[PDB]
């Protein structure tokens, strides 16, 4: 009525409203003495706005009132901007391209949330280059359009879609510091030309509250998404490091555990073949035309894209997991062709509205039952550190019905990136198995060449000639009867004497004597050793030694024989039981068990695999290792009738005995044995000393460790005729290693290992006697007077070498 009057006279309107108002109000207005707040109704607006705004502040405090609060704000934002409609477009990024999807649509002052909330399937999506929304979201600044027609970016998609036509548009981007959350637009109903500058200011100041609620909502969503990603990486890493397994088991474990955090209805993992070339017989048919060359898709590496396994996860209504060994081309995950396309390109694919996609074939309608249709898909390639795609992981409908956004893309990409990197744990697992298999084959190949077969065992047993049966078919009494008729007596080859010489015996005779030594100890009957195993083991040990100058089977028997004569003739058996004497003789036999003819120093210099495998005391750990390996075989296990306690004790002693043959350990523990000898002298008789030493374990080990050192160097104690010959074999082996160092390593060898200094052999032998041999035999002779013959002969040998050394000094 009179509205046009007060429009044409702004001065009168300001003057009338500047008048104070009587206390009489119109409707409540929370009239706590506010009729004249510097304007007729400014205070009434002040109180009403404050009460309404404060109620909004209360609403944001609870939880998920985001949409409710924004809708109330837009309801109040209208009718103060006089906009016809107000809408909210949320910002999201997929495939690296930003989009603005509608969440709230036209909001009249009398609307309700149900009439304005936009379900995700009913939303309108805009990119950044279409419409004013893309203009607002790209420049991150306000846009005020006074006329839609003159706008250069306006899009009429929504105008024709609904029915409405737009004239004035006012939009802002709601800013979370650096990122964009949403865009709010107000449209038309200006009743004038356009939005004024006063509407420009009110829009920003009033919407700061909307930024607050949207910032809280955006932060809450970002915090939740990051929390899930952290747990995904933690749980995935937990299952990867549980054990070394193949790619199938490892991927199945990681994907199954993170099924809760992934938040997807279904997802399938397909594994690609890793073969690069084919064998010759697979290439021939295509070369002669019997078959056609491959014409399908190829990986960027050049492999034929073949899914050799597909792991299917179903979480829609019932947790069902399937593993398909040969997935056919009609498989639901593979029928779309997206996993094949991903393998072709290696690109991260995000699809919204799958049934409306024409690039791929998504079956419009329900899969399985319960009307499950594909709506949103996300697929990423699983790539190892070699930039090769090992699989494709496809993720299906989100559980809340929303399209896959940037946060989801980062979540699964991190999971696939982590699982792609952890293929190294599967490559190592395969190469683990091959190395283990190759080692086991080589062990069997060694075992055949060292074990005594059926034909060679008939040199000591002859069961065929005497009974006609194989040794495995003969009883123990029959085997014992034949061995008695074959094995030499104790009085034939001087096995009980310190002056035993092997130069008058053949290799077979040494083996027969070696079995005889076991019979004299009484360990065969006591521990129930099968005779066939004992004969096979001794013959196998003979084969184990190389055919080298000095450290050959004859040296191995000579050490064992001296150990046997130390126990029985030297009366050191008083401190040990039959089980301990069992281990010592066996450890003597196997102490140089494919000794290669070079010392530990050469192994370090030449970087032999022995030096790498064993840190220190190499070639004694190796001799211990191979000797144990031979005993582990069923047909060579002489300890196979010993219980767990006895077997462990014997194995423990063999470790001590064989390793103590190293001269470095003998030098370090030399004084420890001397104290033991001195403690013996403090006793009054051998009976009391025996009872004290036979119970101490550490003292017995040190004495027994020293027994090996005396046995190993026992060739020195031999009579001069034997010693002179043996010393030449030892020198020849040293000179052979001296030549090897000169040629292979281009190093000057020590005078001990120099062919040109062969005339210094007598002098060095005396130095060896005065430095190593003298201590052991002097104390053992002091310890037991029965070993005194060894010391007497050692001194005699030193006299002979000294005579030669002085003779060389003469010239």
């Amino acid at each position: 009525q009179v509205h046009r009057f007060l429009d044409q006279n702004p001065g009168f309107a300001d003057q009338y409203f500047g008048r104070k108002l009587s206390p009489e109000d119109v409707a409540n207005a929370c009239e706590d003495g506010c009729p004249e707040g510097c304007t007729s109704f400014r205070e009434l607006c002040q109180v009403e706005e404050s009460a309404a705004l404060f109620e909004l502040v209360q609403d944001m405090q609870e939880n998920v009132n985001m949409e409710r609060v924004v809708f109330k704000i837009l309801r109040r934002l209208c009718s103060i901007l006089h906009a016809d409609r107000c809408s909210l477009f949320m910002y999201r990024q997929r495939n690296g391209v930003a989009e603005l999807a509608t969440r709230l649509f036209s909001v009249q002052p009398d609307s309700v949330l149900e009439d304005c909330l936009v379900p995700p399937d009913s939303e309108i999506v805009f990119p950044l280059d279409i419409g004013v929304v893309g203009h607002v979201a790209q420049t991150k600044k306000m846009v005020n359009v006074q006329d839609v027609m003159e706008c250069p970016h306006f899009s009429s998609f929504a105008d024709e879609l609904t029915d409405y036509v737009t004239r004035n548009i006012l939009a802002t981007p709601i800013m979370n510091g650096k990122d964009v959350v949403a865009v709010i637009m107000a449209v038309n109903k200006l009743d004038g030309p356009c939005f004024t500058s006063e509407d420009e200011d009110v829009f920003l100041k009033y919407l700061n509250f909307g930024t607050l609620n949207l910032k809280i909502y955006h932060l809450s969503y970002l915090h939740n998404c990051e929390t899930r990603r952290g747990q995904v990486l933690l749980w995935s890493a937990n299952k990867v490091f549980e054990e070394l397994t193949d790619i199938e088991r490892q991927f199945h474990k990681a994907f199954y555990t993170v099924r809760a955090y992934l938040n997807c209805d279904r997802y399938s993992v397909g594994l690609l073949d890793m073969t690069k070339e084919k064998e010759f017989f697979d290439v021939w048919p295509v070369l002669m035309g019997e078959a056609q060359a491959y014409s399908g898709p190829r990986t960027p590496d050049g492999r034929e894209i073949l899914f050799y396994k597909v792991i299917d996860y179903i979480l829609h209504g019932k947790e069902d997991i399937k593993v398909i060994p040969s997935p056919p081309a009609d498989h639901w995950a593979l029928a779309s062709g997206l996993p094949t396309y991903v393998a072709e390109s290696g690109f991260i694919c995000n699809i919204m509205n799958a049934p409306a996609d024409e690039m791929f074939n998504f079956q419009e309608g329900p899969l399985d039952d319960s009307g499950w249709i594909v709506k949103n898909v996300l697929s990423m390639p699983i790539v190892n550190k070699k930039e090769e795609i090992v699989g494709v992981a496809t993720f299906y409908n989100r559980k809340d019905g929303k399209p896959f956004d940037e946060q989801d893309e980062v979540l699964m990409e991190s999971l696939t990136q982590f699982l792609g990197w952890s293929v190294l744990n599967t490559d190592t697992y395969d190469k683990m198995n091959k190395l283990e298999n190759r080692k086991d084959i080589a062990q069997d190949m060694v075992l055949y060449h060292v074990r005594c077969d059926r034909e060679e065992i008939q040199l000591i047993l002859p069961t065929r000639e005497r009974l006609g049966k194989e040794p495995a078919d003969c009883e123990e009494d029959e085997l014992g009867k034949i061995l008695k008729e074959v094995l030499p007596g104790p009085a034939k080859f001087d096995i009980y004497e310190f002056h035993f010489s092997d130069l008058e015996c053949t290799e077979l005779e040494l083996v027969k004597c070696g079995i005889q030594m076991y019979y004299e100890l009484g360990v065969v009957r006591k521990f129930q050793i099968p005779q066939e195993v004992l004969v096979r083991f001794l013959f196998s040990v003979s084969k184990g030694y190389r055919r080298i100058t000095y450290h050959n089977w004859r040296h191995g028997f000579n050490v064992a024989q001296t150990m046997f004569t130390l126990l029985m003739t030297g009366k050191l058996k008083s401190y040990y039981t039959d089980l301990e004497a069992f281990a010592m003789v066996t450890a003597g036999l196997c102490h140089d068990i494919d000794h290669r003819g070079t010392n530990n120093l050469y192994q370090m210099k030449s970087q032999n695999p022995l030096a790498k495998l064993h840190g220190s005391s190499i070639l004694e750990r190796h001799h211990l290792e191979f000797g144990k390996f031979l005993l582990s075989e069923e047909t060579l296990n002489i300890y196979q009738n010993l219980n767990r306690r006895q077997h462990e004790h014997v194995i423990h002693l063999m470790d001590i005995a064989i390793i103590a043959t190293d001269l470095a350990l003998y030098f370090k523990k030399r004084t420890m044995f001397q104290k033991i000898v001195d403690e013996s002298k403090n006793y009054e008789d051998r009976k009391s000393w025996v009872e004290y030493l036979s119970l101490e374990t550490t003292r017995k080990e040190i004495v027994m460790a020293m027994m090996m050192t005396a046995c190993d160097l026992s060739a020195i104690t031999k009579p001069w005729e034997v010693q002179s010959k043996v010393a030449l074999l030892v020198a020849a082996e040293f000179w052979e290693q001296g030549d090897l160092e000169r040629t292979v390593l281009d190093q000057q060898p020590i005078p001990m290992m120099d062919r040109n200094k062969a005339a210094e052999l007598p002098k060095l032998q005396v130095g060896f006697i005065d430095f190593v041999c003298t201590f052991v035999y002097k104390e053992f002779s002091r310890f037991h007077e029965e070993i005194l013959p060894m010391f007497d002969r050692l001194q005699n040998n030193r006299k002979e070498w000294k005579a030669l050394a002085d003779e060389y000094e003469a010239k």
């Binding site: 036209s106 304005c116 399937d121 939303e123 999506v125 279409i130 609904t162 690109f347 995000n350």
Partner: peptide, 24 residues
């Protein structure tokens, strides 16, 4: 009915070849 007058699919004015993300 929804205020967007769109049922059963998030329509988009952008028509063209879909663009897919590249691995980092």
């Amino acid at each position: 009915r929804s205020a967007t007058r769109v049922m059963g699919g998030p329509v988009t004015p952008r028509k063209g070849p879909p663009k897919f993300k590249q691995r980092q």
